[PDB]
Amino acid sequence: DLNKLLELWPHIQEYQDLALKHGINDIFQDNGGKLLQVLLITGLTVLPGGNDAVDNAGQEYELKSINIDLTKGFSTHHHMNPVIIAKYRQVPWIFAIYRGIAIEAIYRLEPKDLEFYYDKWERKWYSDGHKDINNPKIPVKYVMEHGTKIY
Amino acid sequence: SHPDLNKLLELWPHIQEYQDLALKHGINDIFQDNGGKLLQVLLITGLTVLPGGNDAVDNAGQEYELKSINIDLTKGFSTHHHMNPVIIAKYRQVPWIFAIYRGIAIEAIYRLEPKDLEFYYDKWERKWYSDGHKDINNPKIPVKYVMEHGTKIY
Ligand SMILES: [Pr+3]
Ligand SMILES: [Pr+3]
C-alpha cells in the first residue's frame, strides 16, 4: 500500500496544482476535489463565498451539488425568505450530480424553470405569517426533467 | 470548456484509485475532512483509524491520540476545548502521533510517549485547580517541542 502511495502521489499533487490554478486551495477539504471537476467541465470561475461562479461573459450562477447515493433532493437555504428568493430569481442554477467523488451529470436551469418553486415558497412565506421555510428541497427528478443537460 | 479539462481526464483514473485505497482504510471521502491527508499518515505509519478520544490503533492493540496541523497556517497543535483532569487522565494512557502537513502533503510525523508529555499534563492540571476548577480552552503544544522530544517516524 505504501508502494501505492509512491505511485499515486505524483498524480495527486498534479491534480492539486490544477486545483490551485482555479482558485481551489485544498482539494482535500470542503469538497475541493469535487468542485474542481464541475469548474473544468463547465468552464466557470469560482466566486468568493450568494452566487458561486461566473462565466466568461460575466453571468453569475448559483451552484448546487448532491451525492446521488446519499440524497435525492438539492438543498437551498435554511432560512428561506423573500429576500433570498429575490436573489435566486436573478441567476440560472447549475446542478451537479455526484456518485461518490465522481461527477455523474450536470444540469442548468434558467430562472423561469425555477419560478414554480420560487412562487410557491414566496406565497408560503406570507401565508404562514412571515415564517422562514427550513431548507426546502428541489427534487432531482425535477431538475432532470426541466433543465438542459451540460454533462 | 476549459482546455485544462484534458488534464483532468488523464489524471482521473489515479484519483479514483486513491479514493479506492482510502475506502479500504476507512476513509469515506478523500475530498472532505482532510480525508486524502489522513490517508497518507495511515499508510506510512501502518495504523488503523478508529471510528470518530483515541484516534488510531496499531496491529498490537496499542491505541494512539492523533493530532495534525498545516505548518503553513499554524505552529501549534490543538488539544481539547474543554479539558479538565478527566481528559488529561485519558491522554496520559496513550502515546501521541503528531502529523505535520505542508499544504496537502505530509512533511513529517512524530511520536511522543506519555513521559514526553507529562511536562504539559502536570502544568495544565495544576492550572485547572488554580484558576478555580475551570476547563482550559484548548491549550496548544508547540511544534518545536514535538520536534525536540519526539521520535521521528517520517
Ligand atoms: Pr450559493
Ligand atoms: Pr483524538
Q: How far apart are CA B40 and CA B35, in angstroms?
A: 9
Is the minimum CB–CB distance between A32 and chain B shorter than 8 Å?
A: yes
Q: How many domains does chain A have?
A: 1
3-state SS record for B32-89: CCCHHHHHHHHHHHCCEECCCCCCEECCCCCEEEEEEEECCCCCEECCCCCECHHHHH
DSSP A59: -
CA-based nearest residue to A36, from B56, B99, B127, B15: B15
In this structure, how many other beta carbons lie within 10 angstroms of the beta carbon of residue A37?
21
Q: Does residue B135 carry a catalytic annotation?
A: no
For A99, name the nearest residue in chain B, comparing CA atoms only.
B29
For B24, name the nearest residue in chain A, comparing CA atoms only.
A1
Q: How far apart are CA B53 and CA B28, in angstroms?
A: 20
For B37, name the nearest residue in chain A, comparing CA atoms only.
A28
Question: Is B33 marked as binding a ligand?
Answer: no
Q: What's the alpha-carbon Rg for chain A, to the nearest Å?
A: 18
Ligand with an atom nearest the CA of residue B98: 2
Beta strands in A3-136 (DSSP E): 45-46, 53-54, 60-67, 73-74, 93-99, 102-109
DSSP secondary structure string, A3-38?
A: HHHHHHHHHHHHHHHHHHHTT-S-TTSTTHHHHHHH
Is the minimum CB–CB distance between B59 and chain A shorter than 8 Å?
A: no
Q: How far is A54 from chain B (nearest CA, A)?
A: 13
CA-based nearest residue to A52, from A98, A100, A97, A91: A91
Range of the domain at A129: 1-151
Contact A5 B30 (CB under 8 A): no
Collapse the DSSP code of B6 into the 3-class scheme (helix H, G, I; strand E, B; otherwise coil) and give the result: helix
**CATH of residue B118:** 3.40.210.10
Cα distances from B40 to residues A96, B80, B147, B150, in angstroms, run 29, 24, 19, 19
Contact indicator for B107, B101 with CB cutoff of 8 Å: yes
Is the minimum CB–CB distance between B20 and chain A shorter than 8 Å?
A: no
Contact indicator for A132, A81 with CB cutoff of 8 Å: yes
Q: Which cell goes with B33?
A: 475532512
Of B2, B15, B44, the CB nearest to A40: B2
Chain A residues in contact with B105 by the CB 8 A cut-off are: 9, 13
Amino acid in the structure at residue A145:
E
Contact indicator for B54, B94 with CB cutoff of 8 Å: yes
Helix pair angle (A32-42, B5-24), 10° resolution: 160
In this structure, how many other beta carbons lie within 10 angstroms of the beta carbon of residue A16?
22
Q: Which helix (H) or strand (E) holds A138?
A: strand A138-139
Burial class of residue A81, CB neighbours in 10 A (0-12, 13-18, 19+): middle
Contact A43 B1 (CB under 8 A): yes
Residue with cell 432531482: A140
Contact indicator for A114, B43 with CB cutoff of 8 Å: no
Q: Which residues contact B84 (CB under 8 A, 6 or more apart)?
A: B128, B133, B135, B136
Q: Does residue B20 carry a catalytic annotation?
A: no
